[PDB]
Subunit: 403 residues, 3 copies
């Protein structure tokens, strides 16, 4: 296709000895064969510039787990191919012109023994660098045992070893239990993707730093996360549009000095944002939060199991600034739990020196804009509601009511 051994077209690659296997049959086995070819040619630490694997638009089955263990591997298609399998599964489709995702369309059919479509892992060293996934579709085909479970044991991309300067962009993920997982992320960018109708959308696990999650459209399932970060430092989460049915939309555990800023958050349950297990010195600012109620009939009676005293924002940790946010809460009275409670918008569950400033709350019922747990210390609440709307069980909270 190009005059380089480092450019591969998956529809043109034949695996010698398995002349049966096509990119349609098992694009997994095809990409694994490509990667073996790269290793044969790229032999030394001075000759390993990587390669591009090109996925033309089409339907491709993947049976065999692709193991990605080379730097600067770009896997690229020509479109994210997103399609709502969740609407398809739940309505009459008589006369429908289309019934599945497309674009550069990888149907993930991995075994239980090898559940992730792409396993990005190198046990040797150094860290994997500069790997790029872009412009293709990873589709888990269905949920198990029905369409509404958000469970199938499949993962789209799982980066399992420490990594630097990975770039995930223009992707589509649908109907995977775990769309994207990146462990030990440094200088990662998850940018401008469509990640929806998955049990879990983006999991940033183990630890990480210097990461940006931006301009993504994301919606998860009621037992899974939308964005999760574990032990991140200096994570920037910005310009994202989070919607749907995750148990949460943003979940940080032990994340410090991160910024969640200029996003849009729409959820149907308490606990849309959870700053857990000692999250400190984070900026939570200039976001729009919408707490509403499930409208799609097949999901009306399912919840994430939390009540409305949990908080739209639930914070456990130190010295966070939660400021300059709009919260719009609208839940039918008969749907609030426990029955008769005032919902809590921001709950400070514990921690020292949190500052809550210039937040505007609107709710259909009486709400506590802020509740501070009895264990909260040295808190400030400025202009986030009248005195009526701020409950401190802690004796030491400084409160300026909104004029």
């Amino acid at each position: 296709p190009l005059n380089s051994p480092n450019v591969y077209d998956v529809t043109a690659w034949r695996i010698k000895g398995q002349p049966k296997v096509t990119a349609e049959s098992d694009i997994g086995a095809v990409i694994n064969d490509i990667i073996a070819d790269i290793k044969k040619r790229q032999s030394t630490p001075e000759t390993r510039p990587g390669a591009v694997v090109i996925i033309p638009p089409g339907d491709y089955d993947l049976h065999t787990q692709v193991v990605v263990d080379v730097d600067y591997l770009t896997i690229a298609g020509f479109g994210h191919g997103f399609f709502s399998r969740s609407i398809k599964d739940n309505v009459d489709t008589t006369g429908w012109l289309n019934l599945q995702p497309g674009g550069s369309h990888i149907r993930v059919l991995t075994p239980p023994t090898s559940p992730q479509a792409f396993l990005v892992r190198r046990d040797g060293s150094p860290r994997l660098s500069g790997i790029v996934f872009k412009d293709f579709c990873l589709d888990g085909v269905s949920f198990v045992p029905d369409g509404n479970s958000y469970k199938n044991g499949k993962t789209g991309i799982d980066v399992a070893s420490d990594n630097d300067s990975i770039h995930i962009t223009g992707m589509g993920f649908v109907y995977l239990e775990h769309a994207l997982i990146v462990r030990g992320a440094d200088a990662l960018r998850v940018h401008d993707n469509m990640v929806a109708e998955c049990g879990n959308c983006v999991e940033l696990t183990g630890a990480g730093q210097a990461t940006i999650v931006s301009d993504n459209l994301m919606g998860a399932g009621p037992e899974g996360v939308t964005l999760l970060a574990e032990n991140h430092e200096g994570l920037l989460v910005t310009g994202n549009n989070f919607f749907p049915r995750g148990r949460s939309l943003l979940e940080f555990t032990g994340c410090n000095r991160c910024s969640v800023t200029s996003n849009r958050f729409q959820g149907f349950y308490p606990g849309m944002m959870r700053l857990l297990n000692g999250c400190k010195e984070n900026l939570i600012t200039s976001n729009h939060f919408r707490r509403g109620t499930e409208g799609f009939p097949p999901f009306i009676d399912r919840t994430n199991g939390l009540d409305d005293l949990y908080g739209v924002i639930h914070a456990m940790g130190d010295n966070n600034l939660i400021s300059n946010n709009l919260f719009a809460y609208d839940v039918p009275p008969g749907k609030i739990a426990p029955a008769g409670a005032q919902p809590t918008i921001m709950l400070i569950a514990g921690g020292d020196g949190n500052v809550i400033a210039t937040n505007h709350v609107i709710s259909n019922v009486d709400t506590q804009h802020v509740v501070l747990d009895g264990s909260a210390t040295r808190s400030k609440v400025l202009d986030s509601g009248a005195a009526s709307t701020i409950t401190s069980y802690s004796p030491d909270t400084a409160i300026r009511p909104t004029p």
Copy 2:
């Protein structure tokens, strides 16, 4: 090109029965013929993954409107090719090395009966999904009756039916309407150059869960830069809005949306309009600059609004307008009515709007905020000294900027 029938090169495709038609002579006829080939091969609701149409850099005339009615079509070039025709049309170009836009350059020469270059439409189910336009240039060639009218009846891309996960690296120039998307769900309009058009981006009818991000945009004095009708959860962030639209951001009946971290430069009153009951929107962390036209051919153009209309004009409930900077500089003899103090933020009506932490700087005496008599339960916090706030409403809570 690749080993897939789902990858098309426009410069290589020949129309059976019309051998002389080329991509140069009528790229529209070529793409239509490509699209028919796709529809011929992709015959069933389970075998429609879509395709890519690639547009090499070059000059291409479009005479026939392209109708896009297949999911997961990608039309991609290699450059947005933007060129200032407006400067060209108004100055001495003696010795100019280039006179028109380029890149993957489509000159839009449609008939007045089907004036949209790309018409994105399906009668039938389901919604059109996952269409991509990227990295090419749509050029309306000239304005009539002359180069400064911003009128030619041409549209770049017009998405006419309800749609999901559409993704628009483009350049648009000298079109009366650059991009229109009706019934957007999970649309991304990202990192485009959309300038010297009558109107730039119109998101019409209704929509949800859309992101407009990282765009450069400038319109004309009778048109809109960004418009949204009846959107919920629209996120507008990272954009640099400049030029000469009647307005820069225009919402009508949009609720629970967020406009954050943009730059806004305009030359007339009414740069931002939140109209006909916009509620619970976040308008924050933006820079507004109101200046005066400096390009002679447009020195006498206005949008018909006086300086009492507001830099922001808002009619609706419970919006938070906070952490913005407003820098107003217009010569005394260009302010209307003569002798009036310009208004920076006008709350035209609505309940429970909160104006917080805004810095205004102006060359003349201005009212930072004027609240209409009809506004109820408004708050104005730290957005000017007392002498810069006018509330004709009797129940506005005001905290002057100290001193």
Copy 3:
């Protein structure tokens, strides 16, 4: 590869009469010959749509400076190929499976007297328009005399003429003294790039308008800038993650009516952000600032020459709004300069009408959240610390303490 004369594969292009000159041996000379072919074909001011130059993944040496003087030239690879040469040069690399950057990998080996790999310049009119650099790696290979100097005299991309609608995206820059320089920027976008372990990262010089710098990862060296802008108006700097070792992370000089919002800033020296020489009417809001100390042993004693009284933010100009930021200051007492000083977080060094509002500061030692110079006039400080954390040497500053 496609049926158009405007698409070039650098690996397929033969320079007629120079069979030895390849993309591998000198991709600079290859690209210049491609440029010559474009000009040969694209011969009138109505027949210049430009071209795309495609760079497959591989290792390519550049010895000859590429001079870009045609509109709508796209140079495109498949991969930004970033690799930490700085870590490589400083630790034990036994058994390391890779020792250099990759992707679409251009090794910059320019002569001392034409240092820039790409020179984007046109004498004449109009302004160069619509040029696109994307998805490739520019790698200056080494710093001299050792890998830790951040010095080699090399530049990745230097745009020297006034320009319109240039787009730089998906790039990797590494080990260059200057990664990217753009003079006379109008409607520039520097978007979603990796610009690290360079002496300087992005310099927007001369003057400029209506530019966006967004969604980048950037880290510079102790003598250079990360992002610099000179005399820009309406620059928007957003969604970036600034880290590392630049003398500063954001440096404006004479910039007006610009906006810096929703970024992350991590630095190891004072002066992380500098609004210098009469910056007016700028918005600095919704940012996260971390001032820390160096943790990588080879650089422990490197300084940028400033003390902790200079400020995390240093501002000289009028009517800036510095609001809704978080500053997390952690520097061991033995590392603070001058010894025993209270560090300053935000310093208003001069100017009229500046407004500091709703800022949260956490520091390991006592700090002054805001210090205002004696010459500052009409300043406001709101909710950016207790009274004891605000110092105004100007007598006209209005101060509201953070309550309690």
